[PDB]
Amino acid sequence: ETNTYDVIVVGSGAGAMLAAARAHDLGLSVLVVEKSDKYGGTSAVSGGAVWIPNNSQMQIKDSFDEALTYLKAATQGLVAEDRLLAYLESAPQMVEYINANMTLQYFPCHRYPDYYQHLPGAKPGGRTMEPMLFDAALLGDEFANLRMAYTGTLLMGKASMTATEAHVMLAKEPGWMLQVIKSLGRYYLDLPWRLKSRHDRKRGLGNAMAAGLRHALLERKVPLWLNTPFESLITEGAENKRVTGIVVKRNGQTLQLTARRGVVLGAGGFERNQQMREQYLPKPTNAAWSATPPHNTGDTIRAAMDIGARAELMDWAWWVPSIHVPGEAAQTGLFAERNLPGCIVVNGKGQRFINEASPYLEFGAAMYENHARSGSAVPAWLIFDGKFRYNYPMGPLMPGQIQPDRKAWLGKVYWRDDTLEGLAKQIGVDAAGLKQSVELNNQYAQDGKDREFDKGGNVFDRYYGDYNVKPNPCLAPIGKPPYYAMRVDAGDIGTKGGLLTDKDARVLDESDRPIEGLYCIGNNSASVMGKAYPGAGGTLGPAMTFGFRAANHIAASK
Ligand SMILES: Cc1cc2nc3c(=O)[nH]c(=O)nc-3n(C[C@H](O)[C@H](O)[C@H](O)COP(=O)(O)OP(=O)(O)OC[C@H]3O[C@@H](n4cnc5c(N)ncnc54)[C@H](O)[C@@H]3O)c2cc1C
Ligand SMILES: C[C@]12C=CC(=O)C=C1CC[C@@H]1[C@@H]2CC[C@]2(C)C(=O)CC[C@@H]12
Ligand code: NA
């Protein structure tokens, strides 16, 4: 009895907690189990963005058929069409469900373009959605167990912002000053709270998402067991195995839990399991290069494959160029700052090989593609001058105008030299190649055309360029000492492949037969996006949308 529920959800990422709230609202008894001491997983440390074509809040026109054209073009037949149809059907319904039934609120990023402007059915903004700032005081004592935002996602490492509120500051648009004042203002004047916590009471981005979903579970009294890792599946049947529960380790020993209706695997990927990386991912591969929290070690993937579940796309990760920070367990991803004018990426021959403004997935893939030719692109090198340094952030580096060079970071987070030849030698890059790449950059910046990789050639690239810089907001000269290098690792925000599912998130065996009772969502599952990333929110949109469809399918089963 007391270890029996209709639905057991493994993991407390956004997909898992959404599925839990939805299953509850459809009249099912739910338990959530979380491996770690914190709820929210990678979701909590993310931008919290979801990619929702044809959402109700768009300021421009969109349609199911345009969104399907775009997804068919982006996924290149790797994904069952009925899963693409199901995503486009349910993604808007999942966000309307959040907005009508939770304190958490999503709204569109109106100016945030889809990542593939060259594909048919692309939109110039509005499909990407993000959370309103969320009031952590509504969590009471459960605030203590939230996986906390990386301090880089906060203003002066203190004040929570939305991507909308932020973007103004990174692009250097007019009014950014009042925003800084409004944000840090709110924080310091938050007095009853300032006295019990140095954390902003207001959470943004993935922290708003994870706080808001935790709050939804609290209102519904859905139990969430922390420090309670999944270990294995319970099955019945001689001929076709059905999943009837799980074994967890709870208060330090094994406990058998029964799921009458279904088990939802939302435990994330295997990015933190070096053996699984070496088994499946391209070499060289290193878990240390990941931007994720510590735990996604493929625990549910192994257990499901043990009972006949099929896996796909296991050779793909959600790549991001990433930066080692001393003392920090995760590397910092470079999501936006590469689009800024005056920085170039080179291999060990000092040659460019990628549009520096490339979406991060394609950037990672291009590092592996050039590494196979050159032998020196994983890691690769980011180069910029003292004007870039003064003006712009770059992962853990804040603009030099507000933060001077840290001695403890020299040769660890950045290399610095009075000359380009001097810098090249410190980082093992061909000086003549790097000089050639800088000379070409300076020519490109003059007439605003990158003749090799077309940096700034579309509205996605220019979104994170500098508004003030013309003709191309992504291109500026490199010529004012000192010169800086940063080591760009082939990082990730999770693995992309996983258990094969159908349109209702049911796990499929090697014969495409559903494993009765077993669902799988998020990076635990093979990506509905194939080898692509359609726009900001292309991992969390799918996690939450298939979580919604899983709960719906379980309830519709009676
Ligand atoms: C800085 C950053 C920004 C990002 N921004 C975005 C963005 O805005 N939008 C977007 O779409 N993607 C974004 N991503 C990627 C995104 O965060 C992930 O792809 C997504 O969170 C994966 O969700 P998930 O639910 O599969 O896993 P997670 O969110 O990581 O949740 C999995 C949970 O399962 C738990 N777990 C693991 N093993 C077990 C076990 N054995 N038993 C029980 N629990 C277990 C984990 O501890 C964890 O809490 C970002 C990533 C980072 C690092
Ligand atoms: C690019 C990104 C990541 C993956 C994804 O798919 C969706 C987003 C959108 C929000 C940004 C986030 C990364 C972190 C950013 C740059 C911030 O610190 C402020 C806005 C965030
Ligand atoms: Na934390």
Side-chain angles (χ1 to χ4, degrees), residues 6-24:
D6 293 334
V7 176
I8 308 169
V9 177
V10 182
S12 64
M17 292 197 281
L18 190 283
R22 177 67 175 180
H24 180 272

Side-chain angles (χ1 to χ4, degrees), residues 295-371:
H295 321 286
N296 303 345
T297 52
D299 300 339
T300 69
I301 292 172
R302 286 191 321 274
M305 293 183 71
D306 283 347
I307 68 165
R310 177 164 172 79
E312 287 186 4
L313 296 172
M314 291 290 282
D315 58 329
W316 275 73
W318 300 113
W319 311 115
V320 67
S322 73
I323 303 301
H324 165 72
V325 182
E328 287 185 9
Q331 298 206 172
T332 299
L334 297 187
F335 298 94
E337 306 98 306
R338 298 170 280 105
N339 294 41
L340 291 168
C343 69
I344 58 164
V345 169
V346 298
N347 61 20
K349 294 172 164 186
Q351 309 158 317
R352 292 175 63 233
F353 57 89
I354 187 63
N355 177 5
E356 289 77 9
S358 169
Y360 30 104
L361 179 69
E362 279 79 22
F363 188 110
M367 291 174 66
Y368 281 104
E369 192 282 341
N370 189 260
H371 188 69

Side-chain angles (χ1 to χ4, degrees), residues 10-16 33-36 38 40-50 150 228-230 266-269 291-292 295-297 299-300 318 335 493 521-524 533 536-541 543:
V10 182
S12 64
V33 298
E34 167 57 41
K35 165 176 173 169
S36 85
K38 305 290 175 187
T42 317
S43 300
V45 301
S46 77
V50 293
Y150 299 147
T228 302
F230 166 100
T292 59
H295 321 286
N296 303 345
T297 52
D299 300 339
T300 69
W318 300 113
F335 298 94
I493 63 182
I521 67 174
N523 296 352
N524 204 155
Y533 201 127
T539 89
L540 291 171

Side-chain angles (χ1 to χ4, degrees), residues 262-305:
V263 170
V264 181
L265 300 180
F270 64 88
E271 58 278 5
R272 289 287 167 194
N273 181 328
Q274 180 74 30
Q275 173 275 309
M276 287 187 76
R277 299 184 69 106
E278 285 174 12
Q279 180 175 0
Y280 290 117
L281 298 182
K283 267 63 61 178
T285 195
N286 199 319
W289 301 342
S290 188
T292 59
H295 321 286
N296 303 345
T297 52
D299 300 339
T300 69
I301 292 172
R302 286 191 321 274
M305 293 183 71

Side-chain angles (χ1 to χ4, degrees), residues 38 146-148:
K38 305 290 175 187
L146 172 63
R147 185 164 299 278
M148 297 297 305

